[PDB]
Amino acid sequence: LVYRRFLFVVFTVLVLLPLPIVLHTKEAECAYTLFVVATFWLTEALPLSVTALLPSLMLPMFGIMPSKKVASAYFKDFHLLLIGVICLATSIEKWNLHKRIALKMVMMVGVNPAWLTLGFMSSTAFLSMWLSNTSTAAMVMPIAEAVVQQIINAGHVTRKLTCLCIAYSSTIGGLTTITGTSTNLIFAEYFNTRYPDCRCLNFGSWFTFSFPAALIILLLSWIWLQWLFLGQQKACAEVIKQEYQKLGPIRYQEIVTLVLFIIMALLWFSRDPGFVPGWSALFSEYPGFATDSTVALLIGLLFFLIPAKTYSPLITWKEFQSFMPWDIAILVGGGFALADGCEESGLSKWIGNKLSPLGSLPAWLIILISSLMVTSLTEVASNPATITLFLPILSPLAEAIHVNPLYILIPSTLCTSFAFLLPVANPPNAIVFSYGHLKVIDMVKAGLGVNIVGVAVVMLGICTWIVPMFDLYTYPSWAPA
Amino acid sequence: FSYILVYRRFLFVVFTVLVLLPLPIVLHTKEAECAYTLFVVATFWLTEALPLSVTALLPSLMLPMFGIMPSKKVASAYFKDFHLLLIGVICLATSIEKWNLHKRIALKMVMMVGVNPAWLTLGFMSSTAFLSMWLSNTSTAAMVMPIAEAVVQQIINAEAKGHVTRKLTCLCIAYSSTIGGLTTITGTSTNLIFAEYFNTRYPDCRCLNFGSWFTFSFPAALIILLLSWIWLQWLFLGTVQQKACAEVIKQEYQKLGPIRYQEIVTLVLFIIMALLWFSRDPGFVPGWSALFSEYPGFATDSTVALLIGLLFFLIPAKTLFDYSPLITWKEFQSFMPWDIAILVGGGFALADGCEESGLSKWIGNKLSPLGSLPAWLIILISSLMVTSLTEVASNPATITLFLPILSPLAEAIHVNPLYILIPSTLCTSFAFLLPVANPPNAIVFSYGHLKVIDMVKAGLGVNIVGVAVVMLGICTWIVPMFDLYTYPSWAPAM
């Protein structure tokens, strides 16, 4: 009768019951670690960064990769950019610059009940474009829970609509940049490998197809969240001025931070694609040496040096490592170690030639079902796990049926970020679920209607303006047969 | 005038960056740019102008900007097999502090040995160096240190001088774990690389084995240990009150109570990890590596650390209507030093940059035109160059570079090719100044008791003692052993 107490002790031993690997050679040994980590990632029977250290344990014990080969995959070029942007987000949050450019988009728009939760949507949609959406949901949500605390002192539907609009617009602003969330970053890191002579994916070629795709989302989702819930005021227009004059003039530590933000954003836009010759032609002797991560490290290391107050820098190391997520680094490294182990074992050739019967359907239905299943699966598991487990599976599916790899991997890396419904493994509707509002069914009913319009504009996006961009009907010389 | 004095570590960084800028732009070669990258970074911790994990991120910034190695390759040097061992062995260290396993081993050691400062820093050195001749150096320094820090903290807390006695126990463990690894072949990774290179370069020799390495390296290491103890203990701190400090320890040990369930499991796993570390490949007996002798060198000591360190996240500790594990992982993220993983990775990246650019070959091949010298002087030049080069690169990378440079040099000048290779292998392990050169030097740097000037000032004397004892041994008691004065028959005649 005591089995329900120690519940994920007796469940975590499925090291024993699926063990049909003493019968097969090498690829079932790699498809044993793939099932175990997926079972521990879906149900979350472990702290979710402990399972990422499991490919560093049994892949040397099976004889697939050496232990110094697995350890090299735990720190890729994503981690330098992750250090560089969290060096900026520490100084944005510490010197209260996020409150400066969130109470400014409100009071510029009106305080009407239709336009207030459009400025609330567009503040975090511009904040999450550069930082991570887990960071920007932790900054905007404490502000707007205090603004509506004031607007009722000058009911329940308005506060819950504001609670879900931030958590939706944070994941809406998670795309339009590779650096906006971890999903597009690990997709770009997986795309730099496995397709070496392909030169089509950069920061300029990412903003072009994704900024029309997620601004129509923001304007078609606000109508859906307004229709579902909502259909004297000079004092409430003054109660926002109550805080914007409580904060004094703009300080030196905020001018330096926004200047270093604008300078960091003007780079990544001037190592351009074919439109403009950029500063990457200054280093013409070495084409792929200085990446987007060396820009983040050049700017983010200036926060440890520039004086702020008596000296003491803008940020210190003790308040930096108290801000950086050291779980996401280990989790992404463990995903890359398992993705690199399915290649050195021959599993992602067996999945590629066992799914060649699937290339008899039309090519749009394949990406439709591979986006629908990754959208239905990501509502219960973590988002850097659902796209982790599927990218070494969908990629040999493209190379075997003569379909472009960006034809399949692009609508599958954006639809996996459409996590609007169950708050069991989601950040932004995790942070917003820490308050005592926003019941479960009211999130699901507002989330499936925005998931429909999220999938529909991606399905009309890849059929109108991306097929003349990445040449997705004319399967290239790279990734051969 | 005081504005120059208060902002002195802002003007110093931007002064020493711009004053050395003619060196990579007048000299356009990659050795000059890598020497600029080395001299700028190594000055930034020796003066300690920036935090040490911020200066370690500078190889990830200017090595792609000079054109030495791409960002995808310089990012793959910030995580090696040391980091899996560091992740695994700290899960044990997180759990022995939470359930107070230390202050039960510590308070029992204190009230069975006594409060004596000079004779406690000899028992900490003679036990670390005896444990390090069977285990790894990094594996030894990670186990003795959380117990010894608790021992001296319980000795300090029984006062009812303390800051300077905390650097002693860091340095005398981080140095003894290194000195004790010279006595055996398998005790460190420099001796194994040298023994596998010497046997494939010079067959028909049959000389280097267990017992033959012990009878020239243990009397050398014992004198280095006995003199480093006197040097370190003089450098820092050269019975009515006493028996009252023996009652505080007794009354603090009795208020622990009986040993609980959560201490027994971590005590058992501490023994199991040290038993699996010893029996992997002890050399004289085949270990459990023979079970995997079709994938050789695949499972290292980091696999053993991970396999037992991830068992703390699973084993139940307290009921709730769930259970609770032993470590809960949020107590792990606060306990784990994340500044040391970047400091060791930035040191690995510099060592890879000096190999990719060609500065290490440039330094090594300037030893070739020194053939027209007496034989004891080329030994002293090569051993000094090796001790200088091991302070910025790792020890398995320095001996790998310097063996194919010193081994043909010894055969051209009609010298036995063990008279040159033995003192250059033992001097490769003498990494004592910086915490980026030796991985045991970074374990004791994870506790915050030291500056790096205290490391440099104390490891400068141990380096001189170690070079002098090696040069004493290369002329006495080793000369009759390996016959280092006649040109042998397993060496080529021409």
Author numbering:
A (entry chain B): 8 to 161, 233 to 309, 325 to 403, 418 to 588
B (entry chain A): 4 to 163, 232 to 309, 323 to 404, 416 to 589
What does the paper say about this structure?
The solute carrier 13 (SLC13) family comprises electrogenic sodium ion–coupled anion cotransporters, segregating into sodium ion–sulfate cotransporters (NaSs) and sodium ion–di- and–tricarboxylate cotransporters (NaDCs). NaS1 and NaDC1 regulate sulfate homeostasis and oxidative metabolism, respectively. From an overall view, both the NaDC1 and NaS1 form a homodimer, and each protomer consists of 11 TMDs. The rest TMDs form the core domain that is responsible for substrate recognition and conformational change to complete the transport cycle.
